[PDB]
Structure formats: structure tokens, C-alpha cells
Design a protein around this ligand. Structure first.
Ligand SMILES: O=C(O)Cc1sc2nc3ccccc3n2c1-c1ccc(Cl)cc1
Ligand SMILES: O=C(O)Cc1sc2nc3ccccc3n2c1-c1ccc(Cl)cc1
Ligand SMILES: O=C(O)Cc1sc2nc3ccccc3n2c1-c1ccc(Cl)cc1
Lengths: 149, 150
């Protein structure tokens, strides 16, 4: 479905990386966040929802994903939050692979940047542009054919 | 042209907001940034280039946009950076009105959030989704997809 995303909180170099994977395309949005809080999560969600037609978000039961601030963002932006892991092993497999690919690309470009925040953005660029369609072209195609129906 | 974006720095409540307008559609990407530095501008740019296919950026000759860090980001991402904003009244008109429209929306919802950073995202969401006949978000997706097809 065009609006399903899975959100995951991962740790690297003593930092917190929030990762949104568009399940149907493998497209990634990721960012190093100051702390694993509900405010940083809600903020990341508002950014993502103002950019893509986000309908449903799958997340684990982490405190940062079940906080009021997050429920409020979801209410405000018209997002259905589906909290709880497992929910769908096939969908979760695709998401785990995309995260695995992203961490691999991070290692490959880590020495081309001082800060982890830069290296994450470099890896998202590489991931989304890698080809024979790229994830960046798959998401656009999925959303464009959805507006046509 | 589907790969052209215009980056402009703006200010509200003493904070710096970096605004990127996809000229062909009027779609906006905006964020409060900690400081108006070359490093902050380069980061925002890399974020944008990884989300959307950015081919050319139109920016003013301010120290943050002409910086070594911004030039390296454009080179790395394969983005052509023009010398200043090329004279083009139509394009400049679109960018000027979207920036006015973004600020009007910020004022409208400012009270629904403690932090200006939150209000900006709320305003970008409203701006990109508002169907006055498609929305800016439907327009960009249609423009990029037609370009992939053709
Ligand atoms: O009618 C309502 O639902 C109650 C309202 S009025 C309202 N204005 C808001 C502006 C920004 C954010 C949330 C907002 N909000 C809420 C809400 C909804 C959900 C949750 Cl968890 C918390 C609060
Ligand atoms: O590494 C970082 O954390 C962010 C920084 S600080 C910095 N000073 C620079 C001076 C010249 C050239 C690049 C520079 N640069 C970069 C950078 C910019 C762009 C890209 Cl792609 C990768 C790294
Ligand atoms: O104010 C902020 O900068 C960010 C915050 S802290 C916060 N505590 C809240 C408790 C209930 C409801 C919303 C809340 N909220 C918000 C918020 C969240 C979502 C949206 Cl859309 C707008 C504002």
C-alpha cells in the first residue's frame, strides 16, 4: 500500500538514528536525532508526513513511539499508528534488509565525513539512488499511480 | 525543469529557517537550522538531494551558500550551483509567493506548538497538502514521475 511506513530507532557511535522505510519501495528517510524522545520522534514524523502521503506507521512499543506527543502528531497529521512488533514478518523482513543495506553504506562512507549525521545523509542518498529502478523512483511511481486511482 | 530548487534563508523569532522551493510545483521543504552556517546549509542540502532528484540549486551570494562546505556537498551530490539567482521573473515570482504563503501558514498555527521548529513543519505539511486542482505534494510527485516515464 502507498502509505505504509515502518519506523525504527537504531544506535550507532553512541548516537540515535530514526529510520523510516517505505515498505512497498524500500525508500529510506533517516536522521541522527539529539535524544531517543517522543518529541524528536513526533518532530521527525511531522517532517516525514508533510513530504509523503503517510497513512499508517508501524513501530515497536518503545517509549518514544507511544508517548502523547507522538499520538498528537499522528492525530494532527491523520496518521494511523499501528504499534507492536511482530505485526507482519514479510514486511518486517523487507524493512530489516533496507536497514541492513543502510548500515553497510554508512560503513563504506564513514571516513568521507567527520560527523555521523553527514554520513547517514550520504548513505540515504546512495541507498535511494542505487539501481532498473531506484527506491527514489519506485516511491514516486507508487504515489503517482495512487493519485491516478 | 523538474530538477531545479531555490534555497533561501529567512528569519522568525530570531531563529534561522532554510526554505527550499521546487520551482515547477511550488512544493516546499523547510526547517529551522541551529545557525546560518555553511555546515548547516550543506547538511540540509544532502538531506534534500537524498529525498528528491536535485539537479540544480539557485541560491544568493551569501557567505553560507558560497562556502567551501556547500560547494563540496553540491559536487558530491552532482548538483549544479549557479552564480547567484539567475534573472527569471516567473521563477522568482513562484519562490517569493510560496515563501509569503509559508509565513502566513506559520502565523496561523504558531499557537498550536511551543517551539517554532514544530510550527514550521506543521506549516510545511499544510502548505504541501492544501488542495486549492492538485496540492503541491501531488504536483511534485506527478512532475517527477512524468519525467521518469518520458
Ligand atoms: O480534539 C482533540 O482530539 C483534542 C485535541 S485539540 C488539538 N489541537 C492540537 C494541536 C496540535 C496537536 C494536538 C492537538 N489537539 C488535540 C489532541 C489530539 C490527540 C492527542 Cl493525543 C492530543 C491532543
Ligand atoms: O564532514 C562533515 O561532518 C561535514 C563537513 S564539515 C566540512 N568542511 C569542509 C570543507 C571542504 C569540503 C567539505 C567540508 N565539510 C564537510 C562535508 C561536506 C560535504 C560532504 Cl558530502 C562531506 C563532508
Ligand atoms: O510544542 C512543541 O514544539 C512540540 C510538542 S510538545 C507537546 N506536548 C503535547 C501534549 C499533547 C499534545 C501535543 C503536544 N506537544 C507538541 C506537539 C505535538 C504535535 C503537534 Cl502537531 C503540535 C505540538
Amino acid at each position: 500500500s502507498p502509505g505504509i511506513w515502518q519506523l525504527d530507532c537504531t544506535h550507532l557511535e553512541g548516537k540515535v538514528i530514526l529510520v523510516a522505510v517505505h515498505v512497498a519501495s524500500g525508500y529510506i528517510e533517516a536522521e541522527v536525532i539529539p535524544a531517543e524522545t517522543g518529541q524528536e520522534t513526533a518532530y521527525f514524523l511531522l517532517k516525514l508526513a508533510g513530504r509523503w502521503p503517510v497513512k499508517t506507521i508501524h513501530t515497536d512499543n518503545g517509549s518514544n513511539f507511544t508517548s502523547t506527543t507522538v499520538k498528537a502528531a499522528c492525530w494532527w497529521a491523520g496518521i494511523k499508528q499501528e504499534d507492536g512488533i511482530p505485526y507482519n514478518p514479510q514486511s518486517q523482513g523487507v524493512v530489516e534488509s533496507m536497514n541492513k543495506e543502510l548500515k553497510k553504506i554508512i560503513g563504506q562512507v564513514r571516513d568521507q565525513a567527520e560527523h555521523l549525521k553527514t554520513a547517514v545523509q550520504m548513505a540515504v542518498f546512495i541507498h535511494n539512488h542505487k539501481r532498473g529502478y531506484s527506491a527514489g523512483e519506485r516511491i514516486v511511481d507508487i504515489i503517482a499511480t495512487d493519485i491516478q486511482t
